[PDB]
C-alpha cells in the first residue's frame, strides 16, 4: 500500500559491479537526504551498510556506495565477492514524520 | 536611501553599516536615561528557527470569514532558538568596549 | 502531543457560533501560553480565556 519499490533480484559474477534501485515518490525519497541501505543474511538481523544516500559507518569500505537523483536512489557494489549474496533493504523518510521500507532485493553471486 | 522598516528591540537587524569604524551615538553620554545607539562597522550573522512542524487549521467564524489557528504538531517537539557565533560576538563586544573606552 | 505533553501550548476547546447564528459547534485549537490567561477565581482550574 505504501512500501517502497525495488527490483526483485539482481545477479552478477565475482569481480563485477551490482546496482540496486530504490524508487518511491516525491514526498518520501525526493524530499530529503534521508535514505539508508541495510544488508540481511538469513537467520539474523539486518546489518547497517549505508546511511544518508552515500555516507558510510564504521567497518564498511568503498565496496559499497550510493547515489540519489529525483525520486529514486541506488546502491552500488564494486568488487563483488561470494560474501555479498544477501537481501538488501531500502529505508527512507516516509513523509509526515514517518520512515518507510520497501520489499528487498535478493543479490545472488554467480 | 532605502530604509528597512525593521521592528526589533535590543538589537538592530539588517541595517546600514558604518564605513570605517564603530560609531557610538547618544544625545549626551553623561545622562543615564539616554539610549546609547552603537553602530557596527561589520555585522554579526544571527540565524533563528522554529523546528516543530506546526500546521494551519481554519475555523469558519460567522458568514464567510475564517480564523486560522494551530492544529496538530506533526513530528516531535523541539526548542525554537537563535544562534550567534561566539568568537565574532566576543570580538564585537571587545570592539564596542574600546570605542566605549574612548569616552570612559 | 502523541503521548507526551508540550510545555508551551494548551489544547483549548471552545464553542464557536457558526455561520448560522442560532447554531453552534465545538472546535479546538492549540494556543501558546502567553496568549492564554486563566478566567477567574472560581472553582475550575480548566477554564481559561484569551489575554484580550
Amino acid at each position: 500500500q505504501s512500501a517502497l519499490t525495488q527490483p526483485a533480484s539482481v545477479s552478477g559474477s565475482p569481480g563485477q559491479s551490482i546496482t540496486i534501485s530504490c524508487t518511491g515518490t516525491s514526498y518520501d525519497v525526493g524530499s530529503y537526504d534521508l535514505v539508508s541501505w541495510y544488508q540481511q543474511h538469513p537467520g539474523k538481523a539486518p546489518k547497517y551498510m549505508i546511511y544518508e544516500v552515500n555516507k558510510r559507518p564504521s567497518g564498511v569500505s568503498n565496496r559499497f556506495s550510493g547515489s540519489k537523483s529525483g525520486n529514486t536512489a541506488s546502491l552500488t557494489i564494486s568488487g563483488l565477492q561470494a560474501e555479498d549474496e544477501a537481501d538488501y533493504y531500502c529505508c527512507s523518510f516516509g513523509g509526515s514524520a514517518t520512515v518507510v521500507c520497501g520489499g528487498g532485493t535478493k543479490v545472488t553471486v554467480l | 536611501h532605502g530604509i528597512r522598516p525593521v521592528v526589533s528591540t535590543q538589537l538592530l537587524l539588517n541595517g546600514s553599516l558604518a564605513e570605517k569604524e564603530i560609531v557610538i551615538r547618544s544625545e549626551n553620554l553623561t545622562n543615564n536615561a539616554k539610549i546609547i545607539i552603537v553602530h557596527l562597522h561589520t555585522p554579526v550573522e544571527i540565524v533563528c528557527t522554529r523546528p516543530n512542524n506546526n500546521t494551519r487549521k481554519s475555523v469558519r467564524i460567522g458568514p464567510g470569514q475564517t480564523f486560522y489557528a494551530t492544529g496538530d504538531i506533526i513530528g516531535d517537539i523541539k526548542q525554537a532558538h537563535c544562534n550567534i557565533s561566539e568568537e565574532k560576538w566576543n570580538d564585537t563586544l571587545q570592539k564596542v568596549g574600546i570605542e566605549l573606552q574612548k569616552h570612559f | 502531543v502523541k503521548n507526551g505533553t508540550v510545555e508551551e501550548m494548551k489544547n483549548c476547546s471552545f464553542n464557536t457560533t457558526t455561520e448560522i447564528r442560532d447554531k453552534e459547534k465545538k472546535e479546538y485549537a492549540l494556543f501558546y501560553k502567553p496568549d492564554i490567561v486563566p478566567l477567574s477565581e472560581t472553582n475550575n482550574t480548566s477554564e481559561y480565556r484569551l489575554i484580550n
Epitope: L34, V35, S36, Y38, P46, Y48, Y51, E52, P57, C91, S92, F93, G94, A97, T98, V99, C101 | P51, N52, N53, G75, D76, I77, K78, Q79, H81 | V1, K2, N3, G4
Partner: nanobody, 126 residues
C-alpha cells in the same frame, strides 16, 4: 559494546495483545531514539514506530496507529511495545533498533539511521 537484548519468542491466539521487550546497554538508554520494525517470514521489513525515550513521545505509521503502544522504564533502560488485536497477518519477527540523536534543537526522529539491532522476537498467531 552496544547491544540490544529483547525477550523470548511468544505464541498467542488471535484477538489477544502481545508485549515485546527490549533491554538496552552501553548508551544508558537515553540520547538515542528507538525504532520498532517488523518482518513477516519471507517478506521485507515493515517499520512500525519510534519512541523518544527521554520524554516519552511516541509515533507510529498510519496503518498501525490504533493497535501499537510504546512505553519505557528509564531506571533499568528497557522499552516495551504492545500490539493489540492480533490477526494471522501479525505473526512475524519483531526488531528493536536505535535511531537518531536526541538533540532538543532539531528533529532527529525520522532519520532511518538504525545503528544497533536486537536479536528479534518471533510472535506467532494461531
Amino acid at each position: 559494546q552496544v547491544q540490544l537484548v529483547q525477550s523470548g519468542a511468544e505464541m498467542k491466539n488471535p484477538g489477544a495483545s502481545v508485549k515485546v521487550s527490549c533491554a538496552a546497554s552501553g548508551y544508558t538508554f537515553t540520547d538515542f531514539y528507538i525504532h520498532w520494525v517488523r518482518q513477516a517470514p519471507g517478506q521485507g521489513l515493515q517499520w512500525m514506530g519510534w519512541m523518544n525515550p527521554k520524554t516519552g513521545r511516541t509515533n507510529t505509521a498510519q496503518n498501525f496507529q490504533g493497535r501499537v503502544t510504546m512505553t519505557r522504564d528509564t531506571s533499568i533502560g528497557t522499552a516495551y511495545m504492545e500490539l493489540r488485536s492480533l490477526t494471522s497477518d501479525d505473526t512475524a519477527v519483531y526488531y528493536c533498533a536505535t535511531g537518531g540523536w536526541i538533540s532538543l534543537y532539531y528533529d532527529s526522529s525520522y532519520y532511518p539511521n538504525f545503528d544497533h539491532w536486537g536479536q528479534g522476537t518471533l510472535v506467532t498467531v494461531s
